[PDB]
């Protein structure tokens, strides 16, 4: 199935947004204290994020996806395809930090989890500032 | 920061579509043979699916999400809120098959991978047949 461009955008948008839900769950439980701390729920959330980080979303990026509507018009910036090295660095760092968040969440220390959750947030943001249009 | 209904719909639609991408990758490699078999890619795809299956998506289901637009108007059918025992049966069967798919994808036995992938497929459809408006 050589995916159509619309499908590539849709799948990557879905993947990011899925990670967002699960990031939001950890945020409520270890940063904001608005949901009771649960080791099993934080660990399940961390596992989704680590899994998607390793899911090889690079196969969803090709130049003919620029400006293409998935669920909405792609917010991908075209420098993504020129600054290839910088993408790989940011992406490989994200995988490393996501892996560590799942490991730490498994062990269930709230303080350790909050620290590593912070490192993952920084990894998400590093990619967005370079390669994602805010609008 | 409890989720609004629109966000619940969007997050659950995102979650399903993410599993759909990953199921598609496994289908290509072990059923249709249109992508070369990769041990690491099949297990990474299976891992996403098991993680999302275990991600507690029940938290995204409440009656005030019926008919609500996430990425698109929700296709959730309302008989869902009438079927608590059947939803739990289908969901826990889905977790079981998804867990097993991830276990066999790690061990690398390609025909057993094809077989269990079929079992996961049946679990997806079982839920859709009762609770998702077809397109
Ligand atoms: C680059 C290597 C990225 C990393 C790491 C993360 N994100 Fe991202 N994200 C990225 C791009 C290029 C885009 C735009 C996708 C498009 O085609 O439009 C996004 C988008 C998101 C979104 C919105 C998705 C949508 O529904 O349209 C969210 C909610 C999002 N990103 C969150 C997110 C989180 C939580 C991450 C870390 C855990 C993360 N992203 C990493 C690029 C990259
Ligand atoms: C019930 C417990 C379900 C299981 C198990 C699976 N799916 Fe599902 N899916 C379900 C519902 C109720 C809906 C509609 C959600 C809404 O509010 O609109 C869906 C939707 C999908 C979609 C489309 C999502 C979108 O982008 O709008 C896909 C692609 C999908 N489902 C795929 C899918 C796969 C691959 C599954 C097995 C791995 C699977 N679903 C299981 C309910 C349930």
Residue numbers in the entry:
A (entry chain B), B (entry chain A): 1 to 135
Question: Could you share sentences copied from the article?
Answer:
Thermophilic Hydrogenophilus thermoluteolus cytochrome c′ (PHCP) exhibits higher thermal stability than a mesophilic counterpart, Allochromatium vinosum cytochrome c′ (AVCP), which has a homo‐dimeric structure and ligand‐binding ability. A spectroscopic study clearly showed that some ligands were bound to the PHCP protein.
To understand the thermal stability mechanism and ligand‐binding ability of the thermally stable PHCP protein, the crystal structure of PHCP was first determined. It formed a homo‐dimeric structure, the main chain root mean square deviation (rmsd) value between PHCP and AVCP being 0.65 Å. PHCP variants having altered subunit–subunit interactions were more severely destabilized than ones having altered heme‐related interactions.
